[PDB]
């Protein structure tokens, strides 16, 4: 298995459970909105959150389909919410009156203006759902930018091998079924990677001072190893092999020695002898 | 004689312009209805 710059992956193996819960809550909000609009009760199955290079996601995307760009302040970049022909088909069939027992293929004909309007109607609902899912974890301002037909014209990422996250959704209304995805480049969520790795927390006030007090009260008494390095001499394997008792290895004048725990310096001091013991006359702790 | 005829025609036109002005100030919707009826009669 060789190494290539084409594998420009910040490979992720974490659960990303915060993304899962925000996705589920957005799905519930979208279900509520769709039940309000289409006068029918749908069900949204949130597919497993996917991580793949942009080229793989583009190839897996069923051409032709609807694509739409989002800007999410304060994060720089763009979201790539994609609506499949099946879902807009089902939406227009239910809005205009139908049963769906007579589906029609997609023949490459561009979406009619009425279909585009219905797409926008669902799109602002989905955008508000994503927003209200977001500010629970982090306030994000999501706003529609433009619509696109083919994926290759989106230019969502600088390179086709750029790693992206793809959240699918399977929306079913009766026997009618459709799917739609939300694609985000990984760079959109790099600064908040640790936030989305850990699950979200509900308490925000009581713990803020409760733990700030209790931790210093409890860890006030907890012993910890510390080691003082009095000298620092460089040698070689030759001298180590020939190292025999009775010789002297030179050391410069140690004016200050460092006391550290597991390596990280914690304080500096001056060595000395007190009551028949090797004592330290401390100066200050490194901040 | 023609000059006086034109002069009195102009004066009557101005005073009736004043009257139509004050009526349309009272109600421009009557003017709109008259205009709509005139286009209604136009196509026949």
């Amino acid at each position: 298995r060789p190494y290539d710059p084409n594998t420009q992956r910040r490979v992720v193996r974490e659960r990303l459970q915060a993304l899962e819960i925000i996705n589920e809550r957005f799905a519930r909000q979208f279900r509520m909105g769709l039940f309000n609009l289409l006068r029918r009760s749908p069900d949204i199955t949130v597919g497993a959150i996917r991580i793949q290079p942009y080229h793989e996601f583009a190839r897996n995307l069923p051409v032709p389909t609807n694509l739409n760009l989002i800007h999410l302040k304060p994060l720089r970049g763009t979201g790539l919410v994609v609506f499949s022909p099946s879902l807009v088909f089902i939406a227009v069939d239910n809005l205009f009156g139908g049963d769906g027992r007579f589906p029609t293929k997609v023949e490459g004909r561009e979406f009619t203006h009425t279909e585009q309007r219905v797409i926008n109607r669902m799109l602002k609902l989905a955008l508000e759902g994503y927003s209200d899912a977001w500010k629970a974890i982090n306030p994000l301002e999501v706003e529609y930018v433009r619509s696109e037909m083919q994926v290759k014209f989106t230019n969502i990422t600088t390179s086709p091998n750029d790693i992206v996250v793809n959240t699918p959704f399977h929306v079913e209304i009766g026997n009618l079924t459709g799917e739609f995805n939300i694609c985000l480049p990984f760079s959109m969520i790099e600064p908040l990677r640790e936030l989305l790795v850990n699950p979200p927390l509900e308490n925000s006030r009581h713990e803020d001072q409760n733990w700030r007090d209790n931790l210093v009260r409890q860890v006030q008494h907890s012993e910890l190893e510390l080691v003082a390095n009095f000298a620092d001499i460089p040698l070689r394997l030759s001298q180590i092999l020939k190292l025999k008792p009775g010789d002297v290895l030179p050391i410069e004048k140690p004016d200050r020695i460092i006391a550290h725990v597991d390596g990280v310096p914690v304080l500096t001091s001056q060595y000395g002898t007190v009551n028949g013991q090797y004592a330290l006359r401390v100066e200050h702790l490194i901040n | 004689q023609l000059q006086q005829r034109r002069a009195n025609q102009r004066l009557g036109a101005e005073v009736m312009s004043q009257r139509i002005r004050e009526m349309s100030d009272n109600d421009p919707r009557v003017v709109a209805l008259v205009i709509r009826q005139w286009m209604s009669n136009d196509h026949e």
């Binding site: 009156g97 029609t104 009619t112 009425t114 | 009736m16 139509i20 003017v31 008259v34 005139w38 136009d42």
Partner: protein, 328 residues
């Protein structure tokens, strides 16, 4: 004292009442009404003293019948209803009535013009929206639009209608609004089939034959469509005898005699059986006696006969609807 149309009288009133006066007049007028009005002064003639006097006297006599001291209906109704039923109820009722008026106006407007225009307007639409637009319209216009789609689209629409399940009114009103805006498309079609067929009909025999050969070399099917639309002059061989006799009641004997010199002998034989026996004998004797005629004169007479046929068919007297169809 030139006759003054209603547009002229309205213009005379409008540029006399005032600027904000005209603005508030259009505030209570339809957009197409304002467009038709604005189309006038761009090329209107300067009004005359007696003309303005007469039009404004007509305005006065209509005014005697039109005097109610009315306030604007929408805002007055809103002001009354916000107190009668509350702001939210007033808004809901106002928008409901507005949407009902919008859909009624759209349906009435769509039930007024020639079918193929609306057919091509809604051809690109999704079949489901076509279905609900089709049902809510007038049945006669419904079938007229129906008879123009292809097999698959029309069959799908009928399946949807046979399996219809109710339609929301508000989005339907929005659909009529959208297609109304689609109608407001400043485009000139000028289809290159019927107009092309007429043009080829207008040309001389050599030119039209050369063009037909060239286009058939380019595309035989398109040439066949053009000739099936224009029929040229020789198509009189396939015209019903009743139409031929109706034509002979108006054609000139000398013109027909000149034209028949260049006509095909089968065409002459078919034609000579249509007029009266004495007229047919006179025509045959004239053809025998008359010598050769210039091809230009014969072509001119044939073109005149074709033009006569075209104008008489415009009145609907002649039945030249793409051949003799099927005999029953």
């Amino acid at each position: 004292m030139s006759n003054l149309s209603g547009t002229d009288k309205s213009v005379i009133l409008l540029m006399t009442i005032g600027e904000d006066r005209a603005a508030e007049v259009f505030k209570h007028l339809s957009t197409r009404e304002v467009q038709a009005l604005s189309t006038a002064m761009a090329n209107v003639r300067q009004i005359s003293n007696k003309q303005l006097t007469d039009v404004l006297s007509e305005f006065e006599q209509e005014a005697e019948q039109f005097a109610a001291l009315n306030i604007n209906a929408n805002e007055y109704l809103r002001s009354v209803l916000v107190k009668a039923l509350g702001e939210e109820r007033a808004s809901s009722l106002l928008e409901d009535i507005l949407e009902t008026r919008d859909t009624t106006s759209g349906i009435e407007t769509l039930n007024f013009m020639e079918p193929q225009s609306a057919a091509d307007l809604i051809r690109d639409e999704h079949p489901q929206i076509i279905a609900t637009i089709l049902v809510h319209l007038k049945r006669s216009q419904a079938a007229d639009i129906l008879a123009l789609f292809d097999e698959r689209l029309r069959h799908d629409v009928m399946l949807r209608i046979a399996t219809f399940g109710g339609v929301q009114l508000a989005e339907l009103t929005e659909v009529l609004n959208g297609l109304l805006d689609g109608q407001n498309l400043k485009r000139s079609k000028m289809g290159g089939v019927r107009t092309a067929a007429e043009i080829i009909n207008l040309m001389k025999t050599q030119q039209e034959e050369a063009v037909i050969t060239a286009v058939r070399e380019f595309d035989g099917e398109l040439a066949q469509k053009i000739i099936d639309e224009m029929f040229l002059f020789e198509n009189l061989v396939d015209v019903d005898d009743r139409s031929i006799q109706r034509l002979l009641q108006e054609v000139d004997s000398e013109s027909l005699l000149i034209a028949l010199k260049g006509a095909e002998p089968p065409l002459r034989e078919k034609f000579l059986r249509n007029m009266s026996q004495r007229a047919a004998d006179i025509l045959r004797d004239d053809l025998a006696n008359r010598g050769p005629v210039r091809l230009s004169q014969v072509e001119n007479e044939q073109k005149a006969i074709l033009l006569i046929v075209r104008r008489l068919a415009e009145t609907g007297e002649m039945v030249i609807g793409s051949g003799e169809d099927t005999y029953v």
